[PDB]
Each structure stands twice: as structure tokens, then as C-alpha cells.
Design an enzyme around this catalytic site. Structure first.
Site: not given
Ligand SMILES: CC(C)C[C@H](NC(=O)/C=C/c1ccccc1)C(=O)N[C@H](C=O)C[C@@H]1CCCNC1=O
Length: 306
Positions: A41, A143, A145
Site C-alpha cells: 500500500h 509510518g 508499516c
Molecule cells: C491498510 C492500508 C490501506 C493503510 C493503513 N490503514 C490503517 O491502518 C487503518 C487505520 C484505521 C483507523 C481507524 C479506523 C479504521 C482504520 C495504514 O495507514 N497503516 C499505517 C502504516 O504505515 C499504520 C497505522 C496507521 C494508523 C495508526 N496505527 C497503525 O498501525
């Protein structure tokens, strides 16, 4: 003596972390030999993330759509492919710090260490359990991921987890290092909820054996139980059923302590029915399920405080 949630030393993993930028999204990648792995992603924009078609989004990229940075040094991308929910970026330099390593898909109830990383730079280490519902109760910000989970056996790093998302309940979901998700989750910003979870019975028993090895026996009793009678109590308290395979796995801990597994289950049954009466086990007021039997043998003395 003592008993702590202990991570593996993270040095071998720190030397593999890099930064991967594509467009405006930046996350971490894992650089082994001449390949960098990271969540696919990374190729999404903010509007792509709600219903991405990664095949379609990917074919619109070239090798130079991807910026890979190892500390100071920029790394040149010379190939790319999508493997399930991961991207594999071939780069022109082979990582001189690559350790011996394998890719492993761990089973529910198993534990691993997570190296939380931001911008390719390690920030923290902690131990996690893969839950029955395939989430992990991690600590992840934006950040994070591409951060990985791993175990280390001798000098071999067994990578088992890469971080992709956070659920609405604040727990975390991700993939193995072949890109297959743990659990029924997809890498989209859709409505996605954790299934209901269960206490990991095998681990609770392992940790009761830890408490005995470290010299505490107050919770034992004179009773015993059949597997089936224990499982009727497990059901009521939302513990996983105990299987004969789980009994067998607790063999060595039972030998080192002289406590038969089904004797220990009677102890646990009694603990579930009567509570802990304001006492602690290994410093905890609740029953701990994030230590495997392997965790206990690893950390504990092989000699019991009799
Ligand atoms: C699946 C992908 C299309 C994107 C991914 N999405 C998400 O992690 C979903 C976040 C979310 C929050 C509230 C309700 C529903 C969903 C992402 O941003 N992933 C981040 C990677 O960098 C890490 C997230 C960010 C948020 C805060 N904590 C974490 O683990």
C-alpha cells in the site's frame, strides 16, 4: 530469578531496515540480500486507499517510482514485483549486513519480537503474541508499516510478521513475509473488525509452570481433572479448549516441576472459579497468556526452586 516479557536482541534486524518512498507515502522496508520487502500500500495515495486495485495501481509505476534509502545511502531500484500484499523491490546493492534468515508463518498463540521503525530507523523493541483472532496488541503509529516481527534461533532470524494496519479497536494486523495476511483482513481502509478473541489456554498453563519453577506453589491444589471436565470450565471463561496435543507439549515443564498437566489444569480451573484472592502470580494479579511453553523454557532456570 524473575520473569519478564523479553524480546530477542534486535541488532541483526536493525541492519536490515530501510525507508521506502513512493509518491508521498513513506514506510519501512526490509532489505535482505538484493531485495527490499515492504507493504504494497506504499503505492496508494490518500484516495486510492479506500478501494485500491493494486494490480492496476502497480502497472502505472516504474522502477524509479520507488525511492529506497539505507541510512544516508540511496539505493537504486532495478526490479519490482507484487507478491500477495507485499512489494519486492530488487536493488543494485546486496545488503552486507544480511544475517542468516528464514521466512516463517507463525501459528496463533505463538510469540515474536517486534522492532517498531519509523522512516527506516529503529525506535523500539517489544514482545507480542499472535492472538487467536489473528491480531497483535502492538504499539504502532503512522509510518510504522513495514516494521517486522521475528524470532531468533541461534544465529538465524525467522521473520514472521510485517505490519500493515490498525483496526478500530486499536489492535494491529499484518502479513507474513510472503504477503499473506494473518486473519481475514485486507489492505484497504474499509470497515474491518477483529473477530472475538479467546484466552490462550496453553500459554496460561505454561506460565503457571514458570511460577512453580521460580518457587511459587500457592495456587496448586490436591485435585485433578479430566480433559473434558476442564474444557467445560474453559468454555464458560472463554479459554481455548485444551487438547491432547497441548497436554503433550507441556510434557517437559511437567517433568521439571513434578506437576502433572491435568493436576495443573485443576489448579487453573480452581483459579478461574475462585479468583486469585488479591494475590499475585509472578508479579501479576491476572492470568497471563502471552508466554508460550518455549518462552518459559527459554527464560527460566532449568533447575526448579524446590
Ligand atoms: C491498510 C492500508 C490501506 C493503510 C493503513 N490503514 C490503517 O491502518 C487503518 C487505520 C484505521 C483507523 C481507524 C479506523 C479504521 C482504520 C495504514 O495507514 N497503516 C499505517 C502504516 O504505515 C499504520 C497505522 C496507521 C494508523 C495508526 N496505527 C497503525 O498501525
Amino acid at each position: 530469578s524473575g520473569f519478564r516479557k523479553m524480546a530477542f536482541p534486535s541488532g541483526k534486524v536493525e541492519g536490515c531496515m530501510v525507508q521506502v518512498t513512493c509518491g508521498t507515502t513513506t514506510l519501512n522496508g526490509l532489505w535482505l540480500d538484493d531485495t527490499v520487502y515492504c507493504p504494497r500500500h506504499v503505492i496508494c495515495t490518500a484516495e486510492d486507499m479506500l478501494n485500491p486495485n493494486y494490480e492496476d495501481l502497480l502497472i502505472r509505476k516504474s522502477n524509479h517510482s520507488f525511492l529506497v534509502q539505507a541510512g544516508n545511502v540511496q539505493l537504486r531500484v532495478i526490479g519490482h514485483s507484487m507478491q500477495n500484499c507485499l512489494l519486492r523491490l530488487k536493488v543494485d546493492t546486496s545488503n552486507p549486513k544480511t544475517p542468516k534468515y528464514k521466512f516463517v508463518r507463525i501459528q496463533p498463540g505463538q510469540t515474536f519480537s517486534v522492532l517498531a521503525c519509523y522512516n527506516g530507523s529503529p525506535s523500539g523493541v517489544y514482545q507480542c503474541a499472535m492472538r487467536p483472532n489473528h491480531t497483535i496488541k502492538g504499539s504502532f503509529l503512522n509510518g510504522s508499516c513495514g516494521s517486522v516481527g521475528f524470532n531468533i534461533d541461534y544465529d538465524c532470524v525467522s521473520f514472521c510478521y510485517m505490519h500493515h494496519m490498525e483496526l478500530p479497536t486499536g489492535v494491529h494486523a499484518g502479513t507474513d513475509l510472503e504477503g499473506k495476511f494473518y486473519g481475514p483482513f485486507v489492505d484497504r481502509q474499509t470497515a474491518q473488525a477483529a473477530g472475538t478473541d479467546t484466552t490462550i489456554t496453553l500459554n496460561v498453563l505454561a506460565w503457571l509452570y514458570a511460577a512453580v519453577i521460580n518457587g511459587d506453589r500457592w495456587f496448586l491444589n490436591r485435585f485433578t481433572t479430566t480433559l473434558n471436565d476442564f474444557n467445560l470450565v474453559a468454555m464458560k471463561y472463554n479459554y481455548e479448549p485444551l487438547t491432547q496435543d497441548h497436554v503433550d507439549i507441556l510434557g517437559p515443564l511437567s517433568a521439571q516441576t513434578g506437576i502433572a498437566v491435568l493436576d495443573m489444569c485443576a489448579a487453573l480451573k480452581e483459579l478461574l472459579q475462585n479468583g486469585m484472592n488479591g494475590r499475585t502470580i509472578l508479579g501479576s494479579t491476572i492470568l497471563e497468556d502471552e508466554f508460550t511453553p518455549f518462552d518459559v523454557v527459554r527464560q527460566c532456570s532449568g533447575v526448579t526452586f524446590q
